[PDB]
């Protein structure tokens, strides 16, 4: 059989171990990112698998540098490992070159690390996809997404996980180029509620973060009161 | 890390089949010919050259190792480039110690030894090439072949690649001890014409020669001249 190692091509030129790792991401609940006029906003549908867990447990949103947020889907231990790689890369860049890593370069460096795990029988591919978001006055708003193959692209809007396509079709309805982060958080919450399958998985927490002019280029959790207002807007919009 | 186990092993009948299969890659390669004349050696090869789009001058199958030694092959081109690089390095290492150009037979022994390694060492396949190596030293020409096992042989004349069995019998009924280099070049090109298919130009064969003055590729214009008779 042709699907047991990342160092084996199938007869049609596929690497099935990388495809299987992608299926782990596609079984995960949905995360979205949206770039707008003055920043980037992340939202995650965080399935609560037990009421015994604390609010906040198993975060899927990370700070990887002071100016860079990361949003993940897939196998969470793999994602955390990648967040640590992203953090080390940002730190090392600052030590060596003396300034904050540009988002695109950070995306490309971590993507090459992901890519290195798709060539060998000695290791397996990462079972995670992740988005990286930043803002600065010089570079503007940037949103990148990286998948288990190590492909990296930039986006206006992005979704990963199991309701990816349904999320993208809602994201396409927004004129995000002309909206502010404060406007977009409500729309992120709205979209998560739309694609959430309330019959099949019973309980979720909405996780929100942002980076933009309004945070002075620092990646930060959306404040509690703004999150609750966005949820309330999303829920009533569902009606 | 690297796989540390051999990928070539003995079969129940005592064969190293990976080496046999490496020889089948050689047998399906483009034809090569070497002829040792009295006063020199000629190496010649067919280009597996489809398109007019190829820049024929951009890569060479006939290559210098030193001022006085050259090589051609049949089989897998990229494997050949490895061996060319190692042969050049082996020749220079010898020169640094002894301050004398490496004797042709010494260079063949060291290159053949590298090929042997790849039949036993961990996590690698053998080379899918056989080499024809020419040189001049001690006032005399040398022609050697080195196979994927690391076995080497000295020849007066031989053929390798596609249709080699026939090419060897063509040379058997045509080579003589007292033959000159210019005549040898002609019979080498005739040997390739036996199995060519395409119409020969100076752009789809490559010829190298070795004599007292050293090893060099013939130029397109020189090959054109030899092709007028053929």
């Amino acid at each position: 059989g042709y699907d047991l190692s990342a160092s084996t091509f199938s007869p049609d030129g596929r690497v099935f171990q990388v495809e299987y790792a992608m299926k782990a991401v596609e079984n995960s609940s949905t995360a979205i990112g949206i770039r707008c006029k003055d920043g980037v906003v992340f939202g995650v549908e965080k399935l609560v698998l037990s009421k015994l867990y604390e609010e906040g447990s198993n975060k899927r949103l990370f700070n990887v540098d002071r100016h860079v947020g990361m949003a993940v889907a897939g196998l969470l231990a793999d994602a955390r490992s990648l967040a640590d790689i992203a953090r080390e890369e940002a730190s090392n860049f600052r030590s060596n070159f003396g300034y904050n890593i540009p988002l695109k370069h950070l995306a490309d460096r971590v993507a090459m690390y992901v890519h290195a795990y798709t060539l060998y029988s000695a290791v397996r591919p990462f079972g995670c996809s992740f988005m990286l978001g930043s803002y600065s006055v010089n570079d503007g708003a940037q949103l990148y997404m990286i998948d288990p193959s190590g492909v990296s692209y930039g986006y206006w809007g992005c979704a990963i996980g199991k309701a990816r396509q349904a999320a993208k079709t809602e994201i396409e309805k927004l004129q995000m180029k002309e909206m502010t982060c404060r406007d977009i958080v409500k729309e992120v919450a709205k979209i998560i509620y739309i694609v959430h399958d309330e019959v099949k998985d019973k309980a979720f927490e909405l996780e929100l973060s942002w980076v933009g002019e309004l945070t002075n280029g620092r990646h930060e959790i959306v404040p509690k009161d703004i999150r609750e207002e966005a949820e309330k807007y999303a829920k009533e919009s569902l009606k | 890390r690297g796989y540390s186990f051999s990928l070539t092993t003995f079969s129940p009948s005592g064969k190293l089949v990976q080496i046999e299969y490496a020889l089948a890659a050689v047998a399906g390669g483009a034809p090569s010919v070497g002829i040792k004349a009295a006063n020199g050696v000629v190496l010649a090869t067919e280009k597996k050259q489809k398109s007019i789009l190829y820049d024929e001058r951009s890569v060479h199958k006939v290559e210098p190792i030193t001022k006085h030694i050259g090589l051609v092959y049949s089989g897998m081109g990229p494997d050949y480039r490895v061996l060319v690089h190692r042969a050049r390095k082996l020749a220079q290492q010898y020169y640094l110690v002894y301050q004398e150009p490496i004797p042709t037979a010494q260079l063949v022994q060291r290159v053949a030894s590298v090929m042997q390694e790849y039949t036993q060492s961990g996590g690698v396949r053998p080379f899918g090439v056989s080499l024809l190596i020419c040189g001049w030293n001690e006032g005399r020409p040398y022609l050697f072949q080195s196979d994927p096992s690391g076995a080497y042989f000295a020849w007066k004349a031989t053929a390798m690649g596609k249709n080699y069995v026939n090419g060897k019998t063509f040379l058997e009924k045509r080579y003589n001890e007292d033959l000159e280099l210019e005549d040898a070049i002609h019979t080498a090109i005739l040997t390739l014409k036996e199995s060519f298919e395409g119409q020969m130009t100076e752009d789809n064969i490559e010829v190298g020669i070795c004599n007292e003055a050293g090893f060099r590729r013939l130029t397109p214009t020189e090959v054109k001249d030899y092709l007028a008779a053929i």
């Binding site: - | 210098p64 190792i65 690089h85 050049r88 390095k89 220079q92 020169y95 640094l96």
Partner: protein, 220 residues
């Protein structure tokens, strides 16, 4: 040692004396100090003799591997980089002081290379214990764009200045002339010093030396 080089209208002239010393004794009267790098590049050496020989041989060898690969004539910059990076790595412990000259696709180039790994790209240079004598000649007489014969005269004058004024330098003058069209390795160029003749004969006849034991071993 006195070694020197000049850039002239169409090329490079390199020069060297032929004395090697051990302390204040002449060990070699006819040492060759102008070393092959590639067919278009040569290098004079001063300092520790084993280090100049081995360093130039190694670089020449690595350059031949380079040119075999590229299929092109090597560049003088490439020899310069290779030499200086190796010498820097050894922190001055390799006592090679070099005058590197050649002619490549970008024309003539001349460099001095020091043991610690600094290099200077210049139209005339000198090195060795005779280098200030040779440099005085150059400062007094160099002109840009000299003709071949003028440049050859100037280099041999400069080497001669070192030969006659430095106790470390002596014997013959060797030159190497490099242009786009020609390489003239002139060893010797001049022989300005000659051993005087022997006045008495000391041809000792057989039996002059008393012998305790003898064994003849015949060979094939």
């Amino acid at each position: 040692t006195t070694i020197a080089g000049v850039v002239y209208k169409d090329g490079i002239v390199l020069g060297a004396d032929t004395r090697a010393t051990e302390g204040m004794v002449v060990a070699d009267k006819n040492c060759s100090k102008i070393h092959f790098i590639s067919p278009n590049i040569y290098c004079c050496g001063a300092g520790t003799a084993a280090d100049t020989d081995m360093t130039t041989q190694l670089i020449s060898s690595n350059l031949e591997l380079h040119s075999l690969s590229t299929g092109r004539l090597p560049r003088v910059v490439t020899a310069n980089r290779m030499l200086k990076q190796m010498l820097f790595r050894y922190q001055g412990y390799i006592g090679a002081a070099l005058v590197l000259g050649g002619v490549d696709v970008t024309g003539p180039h001349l460099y001095s290379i020091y043991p610690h790994g600094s290099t200077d790209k210049l139209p005339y240079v000198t090195m060795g214990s005779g280098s200030l004598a040779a440099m005085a000649v150059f400062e007094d007489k160099f002109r840009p764009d000299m003709e071949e014969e003028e440049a050859k005269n100037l280099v041999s004058e400069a080497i001669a200045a070192g030969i006659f004024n430095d106790l470390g330098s002596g014997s013959n003058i060797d030159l190497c002339v490099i242009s786009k069209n020609k390489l003239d390795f002139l060893r010797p160029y001049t022989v300005p010093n000659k051993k005087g003749t022997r006045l008495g004969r000391y041809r000792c006849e057989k039996g002059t030396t008393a012998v305790l034991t003898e064994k003849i071993t015949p060979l094939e």
